[PDB]
Amino acid sequence: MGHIELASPTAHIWFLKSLPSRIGLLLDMPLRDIERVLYFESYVVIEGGMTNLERQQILTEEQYLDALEEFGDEFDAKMGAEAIQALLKSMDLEQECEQLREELNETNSETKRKKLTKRIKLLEAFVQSGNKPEWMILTVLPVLPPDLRPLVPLDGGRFATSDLNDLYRRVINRNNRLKRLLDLAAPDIIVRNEKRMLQEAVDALLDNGRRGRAITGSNKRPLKSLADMIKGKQGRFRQNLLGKRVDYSGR
């Protein structure tokens, strides 16, 4: 394989849209807030220089302005993956573990006890795996070899291809656009749109019609992602790997 460097980070979806997140499930934040961040709807507190305001505190870009014009300097609040990145980066595990195990003892009512356990073992996982929540981001990704998404010609010179390629292309175009734009320091709104379209291209590569509605060709049929190399009957398991075509055989 090979790779691509990205301009800016993005985030993964089997970590997110699936049943329990592990992303904000960790944080203690809901989904909906997090979409409104990363779809680029609402700012959110990074770290209030003033304890006037609060961490994890959501900011609509109208009420954000009140806080802004009041203080300006003494808060940090943004919208997007970088924000969540530095946020994940900030938190320590240890203290949260000890305090959860501590205050667990107080009122271990069942749903509450469940959720404490839930987080606590997430924490132990991040520790003992050696993993880093930092690494939940995506700023670099791999390029799968031609042999597995090929393009070959036909009798009359016509071609047949893998749609994967098509999805790689849009990604690259957008990223290159974004660099070209960034060289000019342009107004921010087109940047926002550029990264919306970025992450949308990204996860649609991973798994098309899950988060947002699917991309198709001209036929009105999907641009088949990865995951269905692995899934249903069609996947390697049930088609290719367990069940076998065979020579030295007949009927």
Binding site: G157, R158, A160, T161, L181, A186, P187, I190, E194
Partner: protein, 239 residues
Amino acid sequence: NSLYTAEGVMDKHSLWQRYVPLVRHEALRLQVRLPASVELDDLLQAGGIGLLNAVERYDALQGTAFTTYAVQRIRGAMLDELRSRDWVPRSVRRNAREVAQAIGQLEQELGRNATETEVAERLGIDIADYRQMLLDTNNSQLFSYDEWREEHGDSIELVTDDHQRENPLQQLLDSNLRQRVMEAIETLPEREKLVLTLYYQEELNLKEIGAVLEVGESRVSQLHSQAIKRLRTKLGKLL
């Protein structure tokens, strides 16, 4: 964004901002075509950037409208993006547009179809030119996993063939013939033995040896002929 000047930034941006609706409504009929036509957001991003470029270099002493200066660059960015995705040449598509116009024009002139000699006439360049062009233009790509029709019996990925295949015995007997070569030539002169060994075995240099001896490679010639005469003393199929 901004400039060194600030009033020429806010006037700039306000103008920029005011004719985003311009971007839209000129774009809003550059629809049904290739699936980014469905997207429409690419168009908006493109339009904004082309706008900035026009903005950067408004020429004011001309007295043209700035929308009028702008529209050109707008379309330029649009068409650029469209050219970006396609990977076939341009004059190709010129000729395609030309046959389209011509064939429709003349089909209504006549009121019936398919008398290509007329195409040879009206587009009187040559027959072979379009005869090639139809290959060149009228044939587009397709995809690989389209199901095979009368429910999903198989795909196109199972009805495929290859010409560059592996085959086990040709290399087998080629190596056999390699040791037969050394078997044949081992009774023959020392350099030519090594010439043909080391050129044919490890895929090295031929006249490198002609340079070593410095005899002009004529003795090479007759001896090579003799090695052939020596290998034409046995039998082998795979012909």
